[PDB]
UniProtKB/Swiss-Prot annotation, chain C:
Protein name: NADH-quinone oxidoreductase subunit K
Subunit field text: NDH-1 is composed of 13 different subunits. Subunits NuoA, H, J, K, L, M, N constitute the membrane sector of the complex.
PANTHER family with a match to the protein in the record: NADH-UBIQUINONE OXIDOREDUCTASE CHAIN 4L (PTHR11434:SF16), NADH-UBIQUINONE OXIDOREDUCTASE SUBUNIT ND4L (PTHR11434)
Annotated transmembrane regions: 4-24, 28-48, 60-80
GO annotation, biological process: ATP synthesis coupled electron transport
Organism: Escherichia coli (strain B / BL21-DE3)
Highest taxon above the source species: Bacteria
Membrane-topology descriptor: Multi-pass membrane protein
Function according to Swiss-Prot or TrEMBL: NDH-1 shuttles electrons from NADH, via FMN and iron-sulfur (Fe-S) centers, to quinones in the respiratory chain. The immediate electron acceptor for the enzyme in this species is believed to be ubiquinone. Couples the redox reaction to proton translocation (for every two electrons transferred, four hydrogen ions are translocated across the cytoplasmic membrane), and thus conserves the redox energy in a proton gradient.
Length: 198, 311, 100, 162, 60, 101
């Protein structure tokens, strides 16, 4: 159950090529360089994650490039305004493969609370998103959880090793949804602490 | 099999070992800069990829290697490929003269620190080529400003080192570290020491003296590894020129040299973490009005003391 | 065991190449480039002459030659910048008003 | 040191020939920097260690840094001259080619008739050059400082902005 | 610039370096997510659920 | 000799391995992975660098032979450095070295 991009296909994978692909995916998922992109309040929570009290640096994702060429992760953390949607599209085009997209917050997910004339209702209207984060704003640890989700998504995708040989198509794994995976524990919740307590 | 060929092979293997260690130390000191900034900023830094983050550098290396190699369409391919090549090899060859131990030196040249000055000029060329070939106005302007900075501090890099050269009476590195057999040159050439430290920070484009936006993939990695190799080279050079190099009372010579070099690498990281960045005009005014006359007066007083003490 | 004639021949080749580049190029920057080539070839010839006789005199006049080269390149590039400022082209055939 | 001398001389000749015929200013400056490194290698082959050190320090580290600075200041993208390529047409360059070839033939004929014991390549250190520089050549040093001061004043006066 | 200003600036740079070094000798303030779970207050506004009565029927 | 030629071979191998390492790094970066007018102040500061750099080379030549030149050479280099500093004071005092006016 994979997905081809240049189609629901199967697992394509010599046994040495599988180990080579696993090492490539391990190196790509353990070194993810986000693009410094200040849109709205969700970016404030993103840079709150980048600080000392949360330390996204532990995952190897602290480099925070100001140039789209060096970065390989686009965290759309803010509202997709109509004036900035071409800017976001151009910055995504300037990135180089492999690249991944995380929508952070309700604005980047669907437009959020701003169903208004000057706001594009979600960045997935024009940019293929890999991980969505609900929240307004999502807390910094929610951004780190989404980073880990992106890491385990990257760790089993199949990409070409070299551009001169082999299949050049990009295979993305169809992950099981987090909602269906966590339904076994979320439904079993019975009692929560009362709101009058600290 | 002859003893002369055995000695030739041993010296070649010694140079190969030195080269591999300085390149590996530059990459692992990029990683150590991340970890040390984490230490100085009340956090941990990368400590999840492997034990303590020791496999992080392999992860960025694999990410750099398996990225889309990209050259701009309206750019000069040769100069774009050439600029990281120069930024790597120039400061690597600058390290090629530093004696890390008695008997462990790549080339015992009679020019020495002059070869370091040649390599520094070629590093300035690397910055200029990177800025021009990107075909970008922002990168071109940033290269103009950065290259004028490096010129304003290479104007006195050598004149800061001339106090040590004057005391040693030679350009050779081993003669310089042998001239500090009793007192390290940081004591008499203190003003030369501070001016050389300032110039070494400035010509390495390090904080607080810091055109890379068009570079990506392995070229950006080559640029950064060359920058940290330049950090290693400047640290080892000031260890050999002002702190005796391999000489010390109790520890083996490599232990003393490595401890002093690692202390200056940590001082690089602490300078980056602590000081704010000054403005352009104040930086160049400090480079021209302050450091150059200080180096000239230091050389004059050094010569006067040397000739006075020659009975 | 390197002949002096070979070094002098190499220096003369570089000198005549610099003179050819100085003549055939109308761009003022390429003429300054040619001037740098010729004075560097003259300095190389003097270094060869001083190394054949085993004297420091060749390197001393090399030093004087490159002091002249540095200052001449400074003045020439200042004049080139002024020419590009007041007439926006480096073609020297435009700069031909005094004649006869 | 013989093979190094001949290979560096050949590289310098080829790079200079590429310089005088190239149309891109930055490529021409790069080839001339390669030629300057080659001539420094020629200097190191002949034992003139200080001359080669200053060839890379000053000639291939300062003067053409100034040239590259001026070229990128002007933003020379090959305008109004690269559209011409006049020096590549025979009618411009053959005449000076015969002129330079005749001069080279005359200078080579004069060179081949000199007493030649060969260059031993014994390394003349920078210490001896500094001893001679402040011994028999004192007034040369002082008036060279004055010459560089004059060049500084002239280039500042002409190359201002206002 | 003024020599007194230069000395005061040098002393202040040394002071800043000393403070950052003493920050290196201090306790880490990092909460190690995900190994260390996030403490959330009881009235924190996160995921929405529908609850039941004590009898076990849905309260909506 | 043996030690000198061994050090020369070591330096040559150092150069060759460094160049080959950088070339191999760039080749591996290229092969691997899928695909999809300035002001006159810059000239002024570079020219000042060039002039003070050749005056620096004069001081470089002096500094390695101070003891063999004696007090006479100190007097001559003192005159040289005095002219250097007079030129520097002239450059500073007229605003040539001020980046902003
Ligand atoms: C928004 O402010 C910023 C941050 O957040 C506080 C950063 O983390 C950062 C990131 C800083 C760093 C990762 C430290 C510098 C070290 C780096 C880039 C080493 C990585 C390089 C390589 C592996 C190439 C070899 C920046 C630039 C920043 O400006
Ligand atoms: C992209 C690549 C571009 C090309 C790069 C270079 C390619 C060739 C590399 C290998 C060349 C062979 C190795 C070098 C020769 C080593 C031996 C040597 O230099 O010996 C001469 C001298 C020895 O001195 P010593 O032995 O101490 O004195 C006692 C008496 N003999 O020692 C000396 O005189 C030492 C001084 C000369 C050392 C030169 C080192 C290289 C300089 C050029 C670097 C280019 C960097 C890239 C391009 C920059 C931008 C153009
Ligand atoms: C701890 C470090 C101790 C260093 C001791 C040392 O330098 O010993 C070497 C030498 C002792 O004299 P010597 O007769 O050579 O004894 C050698 C015995 N085989 O002693 C010397 O050569 C004297 C060296 C004096 C060095 C003084 C400064 C040392 C570093 C202090 C912190 C530096 C911080 C950054 C720089 C600030 C400005 C100095
Ligand atoms: C207002 C207008 C401008 C005014 C001027 C402003 C700029 C001032 C710049 C001053 C520069 C002073 C430099 C002094 C250097 C003199 C020391 C020296 O070079 O001594 C040489 C001698 C070793 O030589 P030798 O004995 O031949 O042994 C070599 C082995 N072959 O060495 C020895 O024997 C050891 C001597 C040790 C001496 C240590 C003390 C003096 C040097 C350190 C000063 C530290 C100052 C700290 C900060 C003070 C406040 C600013
Ligand atoms: C291989 C095919 C071509 C590949 C591309 C070109 C690469 C560069 C080739 C030329 C330069 C290196 C030549 C090889 C030198 C190897 C070492 C050697 O032969 O040393 C001899 C000598 C050592 O000095 P000495 O003490 O006199 O030795 C006598 C021994 N008792 O040495 C000396 O006296 C000085 C040695 C030369 C000076 C140092 C090296 C200078 C390098 C300049 C490079 C310029 C840029 C080249 C760009 C090429 C591409 C365009
Ligand atoms: C291995 C190599 C690396 C070694 C690492 C350790 C050494 C690192 C050296 C770093 C040097 C950084 C130098 C920065 C100089 C900045 C100069 C500057 O721009 O100063 C301007 C500032 C204000 O000037 P003002 O005229 O008042 O401006 C008014 C405008 N509204 O004026 C001022 O604030 C006055 C003071 C200016 C700076 C004086 C010198 C300070 C140098 C940095 C601190 C070094 C402390 C010791 C570090 C360890 C040494 C081993
Ligand atoms: C080219 C560079 C030329 C200049 C440098 C030459 C070399 C150094 C020569 C000695 C310099 C001494 C400078 C004066 C030190 C004492 C004055 C001082 O630090 O003033 C700055 C500041 C003033 O206090 P203020 O900001 O008004 O705060 C209110 C407090 N009641 O007060 C403070 O911030 C508090 C005190 C801080 C003291 C810091 C350390 C002073 C001594 C440093 C010695 C050298 C250290 C070398 C590096 C060590 C670490 C590696
Ligand atoms: C030996 C010959 C020189 C003798 C000593 C000269 C000392 C400085 C002379 C002077 O007036 O300096 C003040 C100057 C003020 O700064 P500036 O911007 O040039 O002023 C414009 C309008 N006031 O500030 C400066 O000129 C800055 C300091 C330059 C120092 C150069 C070297 C002087 C000798 C040591
Ligand atoms: C930043 C440090 C760079 C060092 C480069 C050189 C590495 C050479 C490795 C040699 C190891 C042995 C040295 C001689 C023996 C004395 C020390 C013994 C314990 C290591
Ligand atoms: C618009 C003005 C252009 C001027 C171009 C000048 C070109 C001069 C070329 C001279 C060629 C001489 C060729 C050799 C002549 C015979 C040998 C020398 C004289 C005996
Ligand atoms: S989702 Fe909420 S917090 Fe995030 S950008 Fe929109 S309004 Fe701001």
């Amino acid at each position: 159950d994979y997905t081809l991009t240049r189609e629901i296909v199967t697992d394509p994978l010599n046994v040495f090529m599988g180990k080579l692909n696993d090492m490539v995916n391990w190196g790509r998922k353990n070194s993810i360089w986000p693009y410094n992109f200040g849109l709205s309040c969700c970016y404030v929570e993103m840079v709150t994650s980048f600080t000392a009290v949360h330390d996204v640096a532990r995952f190897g994702a602290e480099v925070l490039r100001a140039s789209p060429r060096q970065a390989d992760l686009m965290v759309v953390a803010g509202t997709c305004f109509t004036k900035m949607a071409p800017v976001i599209q151009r910055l995504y085009d300037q990135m180089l493969e492999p690249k991944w997209v995380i929508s952070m917050g309700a604005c980047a997910n669907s437009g959020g609370m701003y169903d208004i004339y000057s706001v594009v209702q979600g960045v997935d209207k024009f940019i293929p998103v890999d991980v969505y984060i609900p929240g307004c704003p999502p807390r910094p640890e929610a951004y780190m959880q989404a980073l880990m989700l992106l890491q385990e998504s990257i760790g089993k995708e199949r990409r070409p090793l070299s551009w001169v040989v082999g299949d050049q198509g990009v295979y993305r794994a169809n992950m099981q949804s987090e909602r269906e995976r966590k339904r076994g524990e979320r439904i079993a919740v019975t009692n929560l602490r009362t709101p009058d307590e600290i | 099999i002859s003893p002369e060929l055995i000695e030739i092979l041993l010296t070649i293997l010694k140079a190969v070992v030195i080269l591999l260690v300085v390149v590996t130390c530059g990459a692992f000191m990029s990683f150590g800069e991340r970890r040390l900034l984490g230490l100085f900023q009340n956090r941990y830094g990368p400590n999840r990829v492997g034990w303590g983050g020791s496999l992080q550098l392999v992860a960025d290396m694999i990410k750099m290697f398996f990225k889309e190699d990209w050259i701009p369409k309206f750019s000069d391919r040769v100069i774009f490929t050439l600029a990281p090549m120069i930024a790597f090899t120039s400061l690597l060859l600058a390290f090629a003269i530093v004696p890390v131990s008695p008997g462990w030196v790549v080339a015992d040249l009679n020019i020495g620190i002059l070869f370091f000055l040649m390599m520094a000029g070629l590093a300035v060329y690397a910055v200029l080529f990177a800025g021009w070939s990107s075909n970008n106005k922002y990168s071109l302007l940033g290269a103009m400003r950065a290259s004028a900075q490096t010129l304003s501090y290479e104007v006195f890099l050598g004149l800061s080192l001339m106090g040590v050269v004057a005391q040693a009476g030679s350009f050779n590195m081993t003669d310089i570290v042998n001239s500090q057999a009793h007192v390290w040159n940081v004591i008499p050439q203190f003003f030369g020491f501070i001016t050389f430290a300032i110039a070494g920070v400035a010509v390495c484009h390090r904080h607080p003296f810091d055109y890379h936006i068009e570079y990506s993939g392995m070229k950006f990695g080559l640029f950064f590894v060359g920058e940290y190799i330049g950090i290693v080279t400047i640290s080892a050079l000031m260890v050999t020129l002002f702190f005796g190099g391999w000489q010390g009372p109790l520890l083996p010579p490599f232990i003393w040299f490595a401890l002093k070099t690692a202390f200056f690498m940590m001082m690089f990281i602490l300078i980056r973490a602590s000081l704010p960045r000054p403005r352009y005009d104040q930086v160049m005014s400090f480079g021209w009005k302050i450091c150059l006359p200080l180096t000239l007066i230091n050389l004059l007083v050094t010569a006067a003391v040397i000739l006075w003490q020659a009975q | 065991m390197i002949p002096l004639q070979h070094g002098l021949i190499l220096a003369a080749i570089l000198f005549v190449l610099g003179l050819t580049g100085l003549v055939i190029r109308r761009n003022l920057l390429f003429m300054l480039i040619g001037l740098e080539i010729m004075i560097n070839a003259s300095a190389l010839a003097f270094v060869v002459a001083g190394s054949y006789w085993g004297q420091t005199d060749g390197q001393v006049m090399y030093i004087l030659a490159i002091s002249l080269a540095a200052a001449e390149a400074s003045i020439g590039l200042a004049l080139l910048l002024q020419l590009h400022r007041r007439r926006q082209n480096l073609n020297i055939d435009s700069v031909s008003e005094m004649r006869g | 040191m013989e093979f190094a001398f001949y290979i560096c001389g050949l590289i310098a000749i080829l790079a200079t020939l590429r310089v005088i015929t190239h149309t891109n200013p930055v490529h021409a400056l790069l080839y001339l920097i390669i030629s300057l490194l080659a001539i420094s290698g020629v200097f190191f082959s002949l034992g003139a260690y200080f001359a080669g050190a200053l060839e890379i320090i000053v000639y291939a580290g300062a003067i053409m840094v100034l040239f590259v600075f001026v070229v990128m200041m002007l933003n020379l993208g090959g305008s109004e001259i690269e559209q011409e390529r006049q020096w590549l047409k025979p009618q411009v360059w053959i005449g000076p080619a015969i002129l330079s070839a005749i001069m080279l033939v005359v200078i080579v004929y004069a060179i081949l008739g000199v007493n030649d014991q060969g260059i031993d390549g014994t390394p003349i250190s920078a210490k001896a050059v500094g001893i001679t520089l402040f011994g028999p050549y004192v007034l040369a040093v002082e008036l060279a400082s004055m010459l560089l001061l004059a060049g500084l004043v002239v280039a500042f006066h002409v190359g201002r902005e206002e | 610039m003024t020599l007194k200003e230069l000395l005061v600036g040098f002393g202040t740079q040394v002071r800043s370096i000393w403070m950052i070094g003493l920050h290196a000798f201090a306790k880490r303030e990092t909460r190690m997510y995900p190994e260390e779970p996030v403490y959330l207050p009881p009235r924190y506004r996160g995921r929405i659920v529908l609850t039941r009565d004590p009898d076990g029927e849905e309260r909506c | 000799s043996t030690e000198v030629i061994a050090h020369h071979w070591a330096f040559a191998i150092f150069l060759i391995v460094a160049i080959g390492l950088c070339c191999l790094m760039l080749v591996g970066g290229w092969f691997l992975g899928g695909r999809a007018r300035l002001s006159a102040k810059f000239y002024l500061v570079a020219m000042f660098f060039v002039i003070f750099d050749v005056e620096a080379l004069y001081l470089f030549a002096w500094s390695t032979s101070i003891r063999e030149s004696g007090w006479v050479g100190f007097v001559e280099a003192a005159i040289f450095i005095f002219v250097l500093l007079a030129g520097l004071v002239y450059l500073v005092r007229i605003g040539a070295l001020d980046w902003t006016p």
